[PDB]
Amino acid sequence: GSGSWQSYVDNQICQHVDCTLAAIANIQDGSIWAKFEKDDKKISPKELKTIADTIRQNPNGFLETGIHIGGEKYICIQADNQLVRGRRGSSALCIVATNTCLLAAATVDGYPAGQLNNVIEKLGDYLRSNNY
């Protein structure tokens, strides 16, 4: 109980990753808690509902369907209960699931994917360690 989820998105993710898209949501509903959208991108609550339910119930599904966020399709490169990574051209996507939260961000074309992965996975590890 300090600060807000928008601080996390605006400070912990967007200040360390050059993002087209970032979101934190409820892992159970998909209810969006904070977000960032660049230019003409938008995160449907339905995109996140399905993402949230797929990562928790059947993460292998992303390998079949791909990943749908910001109104665009990303190719899945790996998927499990806690971590899903994706590609769309020169843009990377990293999605993490904690005990209560879903984190997601995607990168401006050409931005290093390891840096996004590190930022999202380490923030997820911090939250998970706090039982969030």
Binding site: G1, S2, G3, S4, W5, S7, Y8, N11, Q12, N26, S31, W33, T100, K122, L123, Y126, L127, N130, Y132
Partner: peptide
């Protein structure tokens, strides 16, 4: 609606 459940203090 209510605020969502509050985040923990930011990481280092």
């Amino acid at each position: 609606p209510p605020p969502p459940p509050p985040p923990p203090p930011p990481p280092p």
